[PDB]
Amino acid sequence: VTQNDGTTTIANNLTSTVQVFTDSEYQLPYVLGSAHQGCLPPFPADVFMVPQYGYLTLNNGSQAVGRSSFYCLEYFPSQMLRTGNNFTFSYTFEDVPFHSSYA
Amino acid sequence: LMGGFGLKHPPPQILIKNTPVPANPSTTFSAAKFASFITQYSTGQVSVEIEWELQKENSKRWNPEIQYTSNYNKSVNVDFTVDTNGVYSEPRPIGTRYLTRNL
């Protein structure tokens, strides 16, 4: 996006890249456990914004205890994708008891 | 509750005893059991060897951990070492939890 005293114009950038990684070793704070917004919308016609990623650690008051560990995500291997690349991964669930829908 | 590994079949107990040796039984026969023995004790080495299995530490935390470090300040007696009279002393209890995993 280019802004010049208003009238900003969007022009596709072919060369730039988008980098994606799935941890799969569970070495990151797991944010997904709690209910939050920004999931895929219910109704497929919608278009959704991808939510930001942050995390909390141990603390005393507002100050940080030496225990708190700060993770840098840049430090994992991640696949980089220009226009015309696709990133696909497959996951298999461990066996878990049925959910009981009966009353 | 104290700590450690609850086992259903613990390492079996090893019990040891000196076989009693009678001392100078009288010539004429008497049914009452011996009240007097040789006074003796035994001694020797004992060797215990345990093979521990470990869980290697694999993490991505950026900043440095906390470690167990003996302080570098000069003192009368080094910690975990004999004193001038030969009495070995443990200065402080050492818990096992230092490395940090995210919850």
3-state SS, residue A9:
strand
Residues 6+ apart with CB under 8 A from A48: A38, A39, A40, A41
Residues 6+ apart with CB under 8 A from A9: A1, A2
Q: How many helices (H) and strands (E) does chain A have?
A: 0, 4
Residues 6+ apart with CB under 8 A from B65: A69, B98, B99, B100
DSSP A87-98: ------PPP-PP
A21 touches chain B (CB under 8 A): no
| Resolution value (Å, 1 decimal) | 3.3
CA of B8 vs chain A CAs: smallest distance (Å): 27
Q: How was this structure determined?
A: cryo-EM
DSSP B38-96: -------------------------S---------S--SS-TTSB-TTS-B---S---S
Residues 6+ apart with CB under 8 A from B61: A69, A70, A71, B100
Buried/exposed code over B4-32 (b: 16+ C-beta within 10 A; e: otherwise): eeeeeeeeeeeeeeeeeeeeeeeeeeeee
CA of A36 vs chain B CAs: smallest distance (Å): 19
Tell me whether residues A69 and B66 touch, CB distance under 8 A. Answer: no
Nearest CB to B59; choose among A27, A29, A72: A27
A72 touches chain B (CB under 8 A): yes
HEC string of A51-85 equals CCCCCCCCEECCEECCCCCCCCHHHCCCEEECCCC
Residues 6+ apart with CB under 8 A from A33: none
